[PDB]
Amino acid sequence: VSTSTFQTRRRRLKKVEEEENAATLQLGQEFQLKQINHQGEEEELIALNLSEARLVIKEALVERRRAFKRSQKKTREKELESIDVLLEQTTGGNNKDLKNTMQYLTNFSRFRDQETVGAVIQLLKSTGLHPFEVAQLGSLACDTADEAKTLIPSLNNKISDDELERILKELSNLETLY
Amino acid sequence: LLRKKNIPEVDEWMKYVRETSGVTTALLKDEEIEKLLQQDREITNWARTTFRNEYG
């Protein structure tokens, strides 16, 4: 038995179209902008820049360790060892995917502190740009507004070159000095 | 309140400190000399560089 979603659509006999997934912002049916949470409320897609993601997972495993000990009653290279220890505590251990993920995240995160990831998240989610771009803008370090618009091609006409270049400056300024 | 710059009771141990130095009203020529002398102290501090080589 495998996992299901909040997307209920009834594909009766009519198999296909399964139209390709590209950054023409045409992601899956599953990674659509209009999502639905377990409380039925229509809620927007949640995309994470690897740092926003690093923090989320760390937070979740930290809180899990709490309940695991409760139910039992009756510097980056330094973060890697610290995280690899938390994984030994909460995770199934067979889950090697999370181990690599956490290592990659620790080594590639642009913003260390939660405070930092807070401003990143503000500055960006005010552009009206779709969660995918807003994440790739947070996770890909670009200098020219062309570097950005080339790598994130979906952006193309969505933002001024200057407006994007102004953002790229105040993004570089937020980067935690590793 | 919100537009005001001052110092608190603070400025006072700032005086305790200023008066704790060896100076105050004797002017420019004798003062320039003290500067060269403090610089000589920093140069005698380089001596720390020499001794650090020894720690080796």
């Binding site: 405070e115 930092t116 990831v117 807070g118 990143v120 | 309140l1 919100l2 710059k5 608190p8 009771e9």
Partner: peptide, 25 residues
């Protein structure tokens, strides 16, 4: 996103920042 909200404390009862000497005409 530094923390969440911003910590009030606003104060006019503090030590004091103003002196006084031009009161005389």
């Amino acid at each position: 996103p530094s923390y969440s909200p911003t910590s009030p404390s606003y104060s006019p009862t503090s030590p004091s920042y103003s002196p006084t000497s031009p009161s005389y005409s």
